[PDB]
Design a protein around this nucleic acid. Structure first.
Lengths: 75, 102, 102
RNA sequence: GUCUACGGCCAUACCACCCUGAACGCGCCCGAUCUCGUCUGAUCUCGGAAGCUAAGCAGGGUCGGGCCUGGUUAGUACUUGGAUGGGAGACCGCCUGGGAAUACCGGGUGCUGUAGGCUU
RNA sequence: UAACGCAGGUGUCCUAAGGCGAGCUCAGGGAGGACAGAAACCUCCCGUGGAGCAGAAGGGCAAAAGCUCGCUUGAUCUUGAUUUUCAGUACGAAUACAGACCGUGAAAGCGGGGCCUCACGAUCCUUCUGACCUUUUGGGUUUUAAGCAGGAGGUGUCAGAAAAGUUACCACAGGGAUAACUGGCUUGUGGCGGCCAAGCGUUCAUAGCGACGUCGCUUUUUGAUCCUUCGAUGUCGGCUCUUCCUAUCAUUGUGAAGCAGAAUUCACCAAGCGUUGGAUUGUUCACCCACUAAUAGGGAACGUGAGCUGGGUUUAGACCGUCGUGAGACAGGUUAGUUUUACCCUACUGAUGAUGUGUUGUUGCCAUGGUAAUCCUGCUCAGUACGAGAGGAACCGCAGGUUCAGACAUUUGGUGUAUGUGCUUGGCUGAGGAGCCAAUGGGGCGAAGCUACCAUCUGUGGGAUUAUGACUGAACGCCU
RNA sequence: CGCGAAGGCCCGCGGCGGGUGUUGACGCGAUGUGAUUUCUGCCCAGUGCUCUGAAUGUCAAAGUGAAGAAAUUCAAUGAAGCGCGGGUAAACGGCGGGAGUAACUAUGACUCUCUUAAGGUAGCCAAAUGCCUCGUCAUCUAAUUAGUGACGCGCAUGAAUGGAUGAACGAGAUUCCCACUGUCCCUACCUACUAUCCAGCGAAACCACAGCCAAGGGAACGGGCUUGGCGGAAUCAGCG
RNA sequence: CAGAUCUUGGUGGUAGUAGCAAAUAUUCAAACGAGAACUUUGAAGGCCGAAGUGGAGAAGGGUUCCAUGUGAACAGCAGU
RNA sequence: UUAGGACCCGAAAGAUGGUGAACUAUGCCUGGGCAGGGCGAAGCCAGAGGAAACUCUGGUGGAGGUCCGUAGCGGUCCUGACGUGCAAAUCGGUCGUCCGACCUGGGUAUAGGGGCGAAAGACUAAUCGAACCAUCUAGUAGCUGGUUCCCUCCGAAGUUUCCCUCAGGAUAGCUGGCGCUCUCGCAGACCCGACGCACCCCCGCCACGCAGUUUUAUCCGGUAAAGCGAAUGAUUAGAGGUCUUGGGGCCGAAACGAUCUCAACCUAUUCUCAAACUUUAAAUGGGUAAGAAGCCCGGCUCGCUGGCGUGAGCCGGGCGUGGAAUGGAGUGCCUAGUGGGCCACUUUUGGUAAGCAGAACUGGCGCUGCGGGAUGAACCGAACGCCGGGUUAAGGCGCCCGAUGCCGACGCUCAUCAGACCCCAGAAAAGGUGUUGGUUGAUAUAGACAGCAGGACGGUGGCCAUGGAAGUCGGAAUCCGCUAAGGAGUGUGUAACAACUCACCUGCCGAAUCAACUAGCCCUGAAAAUGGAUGGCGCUGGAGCGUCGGGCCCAUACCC
C-alpha cells in the first residue's frame, strides 16, 4: 500500500559513534598477489639460506669477524 | 486560460531553454526587438536612455511585446517617426512549463 | 490525471533579469531628454516590480562614453559603421593600416 | 655560430608570407641491370655523382594571426561560519575569512641530453 | 546520494565488425576536364577530427582505434589474485599476472573476443564431452546405473513459486500508513477589485467602458494534499426556526452625467428594515406565468434526520439496453423497498426557593439586560415647474392600506358533552307518561368560555455625529 | 429433443439392487416461450449437438515379429476421441461502412465502391430500452424537464433470448378532468387514555473526571490549557 | 496488578425517576375481621349479547380438582 | 528454534461421528369446515313470424378456477401505534380471496453438500448463499488489546543489500554485558627525558599510538562565477565586399560593363543566452607525508632479470622518536530494540502553491525536562542527584507580574481601521503641496515668486477640411505686430458655438521663489459570516518607531 520513501541523515553519527578509520598499518604485509614467476625465485633464495650449515654462513662467519676486528681498533 | 503572471514571477527553476531536449515550445509573443530609424549613424543620437531592473525576477515575453509598443507609441507622437531608436536589451529564452490537472 | 506523473509541458516563454540588468534602451537627440525619461515610466507600468530610470553616460549604443568620444573619432581610433563604431587598436598591423590610410 | 642521427619537454616548437645561407652535413637530382612494387621506377625499392640552393631545412623580419607569461577588470563577482540584521516579499547590507574570468593594455617567439662533423 | 523527475537505449549483431602487419587518410569546400547537368568519373589544392569506428549517449583516436589489402583463429586448455555492485556474499562484466600450445610481425611487440561503458541466469533434473578414473554391497567378467570435472536446456516477478474470474448474498482479522463527508494549508480554476491608457463613447483617453500587460482579495466553485476520525461524527435536497455578514435589489441621507422633466446608469455613510404566490423536475441549479417599492448574493460541520419527510442516490426482489462464453458489471433507465433511545449534564423557555438588613408587611427608585416598527397607494399641490412637443414630478397637508407587534370578545364567524332544549332510527322497563343502552347513537338550534386578517382597538420623543454640503481662516502676501 | 424395456431420464458404498413403472409413444423423461388475434425474415462462418468411416494422419494396455547374453532397443499392426466431410438457429447466438447523383436550394429513387456467414426484413419508440436530451412539432395549462399524439439520421429497438396488439381482470407503475374535503391558505375548539400531583410498588441504557462562554495555540472544531467575559445553595414541568 | 470492550462475586450515581394508559364502569349498605378502594351477601347501574367474557371435549399440563387452616415468601398496589 | 497452547486471550474457515420435519417446504393415508345477495351459460315450455332454413318475445332452468361480502386463510397503505414494546415481529383503521390451484388436525415419507422449493437463495425447531451437538482443538494469524516490585549504571533506530517484500523477516549499522593484552602514580633511600611521565626514577618499562582539528608539501575535480570578434547549439541590428540571384526593369547580344533595387552569401562589428555547451575557473572539499615500519654502511643467497648491471630476500654494525594542541590505547565473544519517522538555516528536483511530495550537510524533536516566545514537539538560552548563597544567557522593567519610582539622550508620527519585537499567525502594483529630511536645474538688487495692472489680442471663421471645425473629427498648412500680453490655438459641453476659461508680464509694495526626482513615518489602496483580541487593561513629552546609554529582575546554566 501507499507509503513514504526513505531519508538518510543519521548516517554520520552512527558512523562516528565508534569506528576507527585506519586499517592497522603493519610491517610484514602478506605476499598475496605478487607475480608467481617473481615469487618462485624469492622462495628459492630463502630456500638456499634455510638449507644446510656449511655452505652459506661459513662465508657469513668469516666476514663478520673482519667486521668484528676492524671496528675495534678505532676504540 | 488567464495564467496570470503572479505564478511565474520569481526565478525558481534551473534554466530550461528551447533546445533539442524541449520540443513543442511556442514562439514568443515578441518578435521585433528593434524599431525606429535603425539606419541612423552613430553621429546622430548621443543621448542613450536606459531602463534598469531592480529585482532578480522573471519578465514574461507577453510583457515585452506591450512594453515595446507602449514606449514606442509615445515617442512616435513626441519626436517624429525617424527621430529616435529603441532596442529591447532582453530576450525571452527560458521556456516555462504548465500542467492541466482537472 | 491525479498527479500520478506531473512534469509540465511547455507554454509561453520568459526572460530573467538580475539586479542591475538593463531591460530597455532608447537612443535620441540630446534635446529630447524629457521625451525619453517619461516614455520609459510609461513603459514601466507593463512590468512586474519596480525599475529605475536614468540617462546613460555612454554615447549612443557604443561601448565608449561621454564627451571624450568626439576626440577619438577625430584622433582616428574609431570609425562610424551603422549602428556602431569599430575600435581601431594598435596591435593590428597599423603600419599596414596607416600605409593603407593615415 | 651551426649542422647530422637518435630523443626528452610537446606551439615561446604552429600558420601566413618576405629576405639570407656556414664543404653534396641534409636535400634537390641522374637512371632501372640486379633486389622490389606499381596503370605509371611520380611513391616504394635499387645503382650513382653532371649539375643545383630555386624548393626542403636553418637563421632573421611582420608596430602579423596564433601561442606563453604579466598588468588593469577587482578586492568586483562568488563563497565557508554568525545574528531576535533590513525587507510582506523578490532579494540586500554587515561581521569573520577565502577570492576568480572576458573586453582592454604590455612583455616574450624554444630550452636541451648522448653520439658525430664543419670554420665556407 | 530520491520521486510514476528529465532526453534516450537493451534481451540483439559479428568467420569478421576478432588477432596481427603493411600501405593509405577522412567530412567538407574551391578551381579545372568529351558527352556531364548542383548531384557519376579524372587531377590539383585547403582541410586538427568538422568523418568513421553495428546500435543509445558520453569518453577515445590521423604514418589510429578510420579505409583497403596479405596471413590466421589468443573466441583455445588449466591454476590462483584483484576491481565494480555501500552485506565487501553470489551471478554477470572486467584488470593485472602465471603455467601450456599458437597466430602475425624480419623485428621489439601485440593478441587468452569486439576501443571502454550494457547485451544476461542458483539448488534439484535431463543432455553432451574427459581419464586404461572411482563404486555397482560374498568374489569375478560384461551390459546397466551412481559418481567426479567442464559446457548446454531457465526461471524477463530477471538471488530464480507451477496458477483464471465474480460476489449488489458475502465473512473475519485489522487500517485513518489507505479513499467517499465536513474541518485544515494553497488558490491553478471559478468570483470580485485596482494600476497603466491604445482606443470606443459623432466632439474627447477616464460621463459610461477600457484591449496589449500587471497587481491583489475572497473560500459562496471545482481542483491539488492526506493532518483528525474506519472498536462508526448517520452521507442529497425540501418543510420549520434563529442569528450573522456586505461585495446593496428596494427604502432614509447624499455625490456625477453626454442630466431639460420621466425613467435612469457610476459612486459614498449605510445590514435598521423588507426580498413573494405558482406549473415542470428528487432536485441545489434552470426556465417560465403574476403581483410587487426590488423580487440582491451569502455563512453558521456544503446550519438544521434522538426535528420530519425518504422523492434520489446507495443493500437484498425484479425488467430493459450494452458488455461478458459465464458468474456478473454499467461512473445508463425504471419499479417495491423497517429511519431506533431522553428520565442524565449543559444550554434554553417557564416555575418554587436561596444568602443580608432583628422578624414581617406595604409603597417605590434604576444598576443593568431585551428593543419594534417598516413599506405603499389615492386626492390635493398640478396636467403646473421642466420642455417645440410628445410627455411630466417633488416639499407641506388630507384619507387609507401591505408586512410585523401587543391585546381583546361589544358585534360576526368557529367550537360545543352546561350532554341545555327540541326532532329521530334500533332495542329495553306490560302500555301512557318519564326515561335509559348503541365506546359522545344521529341530526337541528345554542349560553358561558376559548378563539380568527374570519370580527375589534393601539403602535411614539430627543441627543451625538458619519457620508455630503458649508462658515470663518493660515500654511503658501492671493486661494481654499 | 431422447426413448420400443440386455431401452430414455435418474438414485445408489455394494448385489438377478431401486424411482418413472399397478407405466408403453394420445406415454415417461429434458428444455424454451407464455391466453386469444396476426406474423416468426437472413446467417451453419464462430461456439456446441449429431450423422459415416477404410484409402484412414495422430493414437494407449495387451498381442506379433527383429537384434542382443538378458534387462531391453526397434519395427509393423493399430478401438473410441480428435483431424477430414454432411445437417441443424422455436440450439447459444449475430444481422456494414464510404462517395456522386432529379428544373433555385435543401432529400434521394438511381449508379460506382470496399467488405462479411448474413448485412436489421415485417413492425415499433426518444417508450421500463434514445448518452446529445429539458430532442423538434401539436394538445392540455396563464406558466408544464412530467402525460399524451406524430416524426426517425435508433450510442444501445426487433421477431418463441419472441415482435405488435388487445375486451375482461390487478391492494402493479404514471398524467388529467368532475365531486369532495383542514392537505393548505390560518389556525381554533370539544371529548376519551396518558402526561402532571399524591398513596403503594418501583426497574435499565449509561458513567476516565465532570459539565457556562469568545478568541489563541494545538492532533489544524476545548468542558479542562493561555488571555479575557465572569461564577452563587437546593430544585420542579418542558426542550431537542 | 490499574488497565486486556479481561473472569467471578459485590455495590453506587442515574432514582424514589421512567413506569404500573389495549378491549365503556362502577356505586350504596351490611359480615367475619386487628386491619377493608379489592374478600363474601344484599340493592342498583353496566357489559360479554348465543361466529359469547356461556355449557362440554381432543392434543398438552399432572393433582392445579374439593374441603379445613395459615398469614414467612409469590400473585410487579393491596388483600380476611 | 521445536514443541507440551508455548507470553495470555482472539478468528472467517476445514475434518470425522451423530440428534432433529413439535416451525416450515412438498407427496401420500384418514377425518373436519366454508352466512347472505348479484350476474343468469347449456337444457325445457308457451306465444308470434316464414315455404324451409329457423328467426324474434315471455317464462323455466342454476352452469362458473365468475362478482359484492361474513367466518377461515393472508398482510396493501397509513412508510399510523409500541419501538428498554403486549410481542426477539404484536395492535387499530383501511385491505386481497372466500366452491377452488380452498383452509385445517392427526398418521407416514424425504436429513446437511443433503431434503424441499408455483423458484425469493426461500424453508429445515427464533440459526441457512451448505442446521444443530460432541470431538480433531488450547486449530494457524507479518494482525488489535494486556503483561504485575524499588533503586543504580549504560543507552539506540526508523538507514544498506536480499526476499510473493511493502503492516513482516535475514543481513550490515547503531546498543549492553563479560572480559583479555599492554601503558599506568601499585613510580622506595640515590641524584630521569638527542623518547613520555609520576618522582631519585620506571632495573621489568608500547612513548610507540590514535583523532567528525588546524600548520607545512604535493596531488585531485569541473559546481558558483564567467565566456561566446573561443568549439556545439540558440539569437538581434546595422555597416562594407562581389559571386549565383531576383523582383521592378532599360537595351532587344547583355548587364551581378555601369546604374538604380532587394538579396542569399563573405568580411570585419554588434544585442542576448545554455542542467543534458565550454577555452578559463574559485570558496568550501577529498588522499597522502610529517622518521626507529627510519637514516646509513659491510657481507651472503637465486631455478627470475643479464654490460660488466641485477631486483627481491637474508645476515651483521653505528645513529632512537623528528610540526602545533588533547587523553591511556588495543583486542575477543554473546547480543535484546530498530528497520512507519518528522522539523529548521542552507543547497535543491516536481508543482501555481501547499501545515505537499522527493534528495545532501549539520543540528534538533521521537528519548527531553528547565528560563523566554501570553498559549505551542521542532524557534532563542540551556542540557536535570537534594539544597543554601552569588552572578548570568535569551528575554525584559506602566499594572496584571520579579525589575526604570533613571526627573534617561537625539529625533520621527495623528490614525472617524494608529503602532507595538526571530520562526509568527503585522497584504501588493499604485497614489497623497499629510509631514521630515535629501539629490538635481534654476532666479534675486542688469531685484525676486505673489497681489494689485492689463488678458485668450487683431488682419482672420487665416488658407483649407467641406468632414458640419470662428481653439476642437482631422489637413502638407498654422504667421505677423505687440515683442507686459495671448497657442491661425489647451482642459468644459456642442447646431457651426456663444459662453467658463487653460499663458507672458509693465509700476508698487520687498527676501527668499519655482520644478522634477527621492526616501523615512502616517494615510488611501484594504470585502464576510457567534462578540474578538499587540496576551488583557490601557497607552499619545509614550506604555508607538529608529539609533543607544546607566541601573535593575531569575533557569534545574556558571561560581563557592
Amino acid at each position: 500500500a501507499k507509503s513514504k520513501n526513505h531519508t538518510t541523515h543519521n548516517q554520520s553519527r552512527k558512523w562516528h559513534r565508534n569506528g576507527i578509520k585506519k586499517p592497522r598499518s603493519q610491517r610484514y604485509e602478506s605476499l598475496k598477489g605478487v607475480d608467481p614467476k617473481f615469487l618462485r625465485n624469492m622462495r628459492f633464495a630463502k630456500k638456499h639460506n634455510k638449507k644446510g650449515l656449511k655452505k652459506m654462513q661459513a662465508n657469513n662467519a668469516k666476514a663478520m669477524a673482519a667486521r668484528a676486528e676492524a671496528i675495534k681498533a678505532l676504540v | 486560460g488567464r495564467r496570470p503572471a503572479r505564478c511565474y514571477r520569481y526565478c525558481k527553476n534551473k534554466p530550461y531553454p528551447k533546445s533539442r531536449f524541449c520540443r513543442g515550445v511556442p514562439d514568443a509573443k515578441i518578435r521585433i526587438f528593434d524599431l525606429g530609424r535603425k539606419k541612423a549613424k552613430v553621429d546622430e543620437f548621443p543621448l542613450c536612455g536606459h531602463m534598469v531592473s531592480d529585482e532578480y525576477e522573471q519578465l514574461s515575453s507577453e510583457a515585452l511585446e506591450a512594453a515595446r509598443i507602449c514606449a514606442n507609441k509615445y515617442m512616435v507622437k513626441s519626436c517624429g517617426k525617424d527621430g529616435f531608436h529603441i532596442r529591447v536589451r532582453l530576450h525571452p529564452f527560458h521556456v516555462i512549463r504548465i500542467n492541466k490537472m482537472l | 490525471t491525479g498527479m500520478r506523473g506531473a512534469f509540465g509541458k511547455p507554454q509561453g516563454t520568459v526572460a530573467r533579469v538580475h539586479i542591475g540588468q538593463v531591460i530597455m534602451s532608447i537612443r535620441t537627440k540630446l534635446q529630447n531628454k524629457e521625451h525619453v525619461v517619461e516614455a520609459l515610466r510609461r513603459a514601466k507600468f507593463k512590468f512586474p516590480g519596480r525599475q529605475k530610470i536614468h540617462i546613460s553616460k555612454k554615447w549612443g549604443f557604443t561601448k565608449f562614453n561621454a564627451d571624450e568620444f568626439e576626440d577619438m573619432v577625430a584622433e582616428k581610433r574609431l570609425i562610424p559603421d551603422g549602428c556602431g563604431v569599430k575600435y581601431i587598436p594598435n596591435r593590428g598591423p597599423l603600419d599596414k593600416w596607416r600605409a593603407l590610410h593615415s
